Amino acid sequence: GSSGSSGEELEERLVEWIVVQCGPDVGRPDRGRLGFQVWLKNGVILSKLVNSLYPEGSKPVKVPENPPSMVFKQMEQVAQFLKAAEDYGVIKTDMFQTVDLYEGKDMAAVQRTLMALGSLAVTKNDGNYRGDPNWFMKSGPSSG
Fold it and tell me: Residue limits of the Calponin-homology (CH) domain?
């Protein structure tokens, strides 16, 4: 199901976003091997993203001080964001499986998800995106 290469353009941007969102703290994906999938594996960064958007009087997910390690935890950490993502407006056709990400079972999906989030934010944009709306937008459906 499609080639799951470690690069592409979208990815680049995706990160470029998670960079402005999270900030120069989470860092970036290390070269070689997955790097990216692993970057968005723990979930902490993911949970931080969604949060970055959500207001202060909301905070859907709960990001602890130190990042976990255990599977159940890591796996859940993501779920917290995944479910949170949907809330934003994301559909169930753009959402992937914790594994698809955790075990990079499917990277093409990992994108479909974010692709929605960002875009969703790009559509709204009211003080959440710490980048540019002309990042994800390119050619597709408008509102719905």
Answer: 8-121
